[model samples]
Target: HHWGYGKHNGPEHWHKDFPIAKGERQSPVDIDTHTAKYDPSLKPLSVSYDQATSLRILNNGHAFNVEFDDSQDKAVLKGGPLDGTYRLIQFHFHWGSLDGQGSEHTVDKKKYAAELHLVHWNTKYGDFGKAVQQPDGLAVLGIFLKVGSAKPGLQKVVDVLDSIKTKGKSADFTNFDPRGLLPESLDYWTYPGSLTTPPLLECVTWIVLKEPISVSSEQVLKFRKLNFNGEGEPEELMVDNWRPAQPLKNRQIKASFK
Candidate 1:
């Protein structure tokens, strides 16, 4: 009853409770290739992660997130439209109920099968909770998922889904390198925006990759098996949890490549 994607409390109704839901810089903006400006000044991104830091995987009612040990700089993101180092906290996804329905950001009005987001918080803010309230605190790296050949790298993570199928469930997940999921090209579009979810904080610097990683239809369907409700609550499939793209307003989205 709090807030959800349904007839009663969907994106259309979010603005009613969370005023920032309609904030000017909200995320998931559609990208127009011709209109995007290329900026050579943006530094190449530096990403490092240790398998030992992959703490656990949890079904937080919204989506399944693979949490990391942000206690140290073991896994951190630097460069590319950033002020300083940002620790990798967790990574999650937004998907559709079916093929062609996934992905939050559209390019030329084309949507992919799914989208992956790696969430990081700036070290300058001390902690993630405190960083969430600051404009320069969070940086989210987004990758699109298209339907194609199977991704063997993803099987290790998918194999554990059965253990954490319901909300509030989790299992120890270690030795997984998120870099295994990235594409060859580091090219991306950068912008200032808000978190795509509620308490939609206006504090994210989004870096959406230009190249998409491949995922078979079979693999993405596994995401739909997840339950939104925990024990004793009516079960609901955790599909189509993405918020629609917000307005660009007056902001300029910069790119890393031409």
Candidate 2:
């Protein structure tokens, strides 16, 4: 089963997991690299526990931007595969202007309804601000949100979206447990990869899921209808926002069925 967009598409995992299926990481799915990067030891960094304490929710009118302050988190990477414990810094998400596209990790040239990334760093060596400077200090867990009638466990948050319905509008999402927002299953595909965006830093351990949860079309519509900007002006609403897929670069994706 497929769960996301861009290069991480297909269940081949990453693009190889269940984005759509393996051999389909390109536009219309051109995943036939006929090649492999045999770094079997290259695995997904592990993590014990993380906390999302302070919450700063902003209304960019693209959707809600809820940031954390002291989230107890860390990435157990190869520590660049050499370091020790990754730190639990802060992380955010990038959605689409529509419901079917707009994200950083894509499947081929195809798009997804949306995506969320739980970002972390290697604290075994340094802080995220500096750990990111290292080669293997990042681990991001990516999840897909499909636009439909099914609930996404976002009801608790959506109840507050209207308060900051305009751009530059912000609020504090306190007393909220960030972990409660995570999708149920942790079973995922791990791989050596880069950020799905600029800097495209290849210092990451990506965990792409194989399943997707549903979000209310009404909620999805509300985001696309946001009208707020810095100068109190109307901006392009948040619709299908997703990132395109990345090249494998002869990388191998490992699974965590263990």
Candidate 3:
């Protein structure tokens, strides 16, 4: 049996196959702003993306990912807590059945409607496969999505969801610039953590934006229409596909702004 967000195969049972699921630096932690210290030495984060690099969008049973070409540094993230350049590989979203409880990482225990993750791998580590095993190999930029006004940039993604309603479905998605999805403020909370999902390697440097982007409630309904089960299997809507907040342990979350 595979891991899923269900009663039988949900997050609680991940440790049975992957022991690191209970590791010390686990992710999707509660961002208690009161405890985060502003770091003066941290540089302003830089994100550059080439619109032509967006390849396609696919449903991998868990979530839909918009993959990019990583053969070169066309789409890259640098500065801040990162040591060197990290190339963007893919971006995905996590949401809930309802509009009020989807975001993985929260601010003072406030859950947003959804969350977006832009995954990048450090260039010094050679490639994403090898990088996932290194301590400072991956950098994931997280943006919270609140339900309100309709976002044109996000609408572009929602428009294509109808074509990928089932697992393993995909469509050509090119010339998309992910930068438009970011909020006006770049202020963020940084921490060393692991991937929220299984095979939870503690190689990620999480950069969660302080501000949240807005999306219409109708747009969120489009996301919920996706199926966790593929065609010919038990039909199940893909909702609440997010892991809960993990323990902070001894880690300290640094803020990019005062």
| Model 1 CA lDDT for position 18 | 93
Give one digit per residue, the lDDT tens place, for model 3 in 1-258: 999999999999999999998889998899999899999999999988753399999999999999999999899999999999999999999999998899999999999999999999999988999999999999999999999999888878999998988899999999888978989988899999988887899999999999999999899999999999888588899999999999999999999998
Backbone clashes in model 3, listed as residue pairs: none
Runs of candidate 1 exceeding 4 Å displacement: 50-52
Clashing pairs in 1: none
Which candidate gets the maximum TM-score versus the true structure? 3
Candidate 2 structure quality by residue, lDDT tens digits, 1-258: 333332343113343332322222221111222322234453444444444464677865434566665334522323223345554444445566666675555543445576777676766654566655655767677766777765645666677767776668888776555565456665455566665533345567666654565687776665555543444565544444344454564555544443
Candidate 2's TM-score reads: 0.67
Error of 3 at 65 (Å): 0.4
Model 3 ranges off by over 4 Å:
none
Cα lDDT of model 1 by residue, 60-156, tens digit = 8888999998888888988999989999999999999988878989897789889999999999999999999999989999999998988888888
Alpha carbon deviation, residue 104, candidate 3 (Å)? 0.6
Cα lDDT, all candidates? 0.90, 0.53, 0.93
lDDT of 1 at 47: 83
Worst 10 residues of 1 by lDDT: 46-55
Q: Which candidate, 2 or 3, has the higher lDDT? A: 3
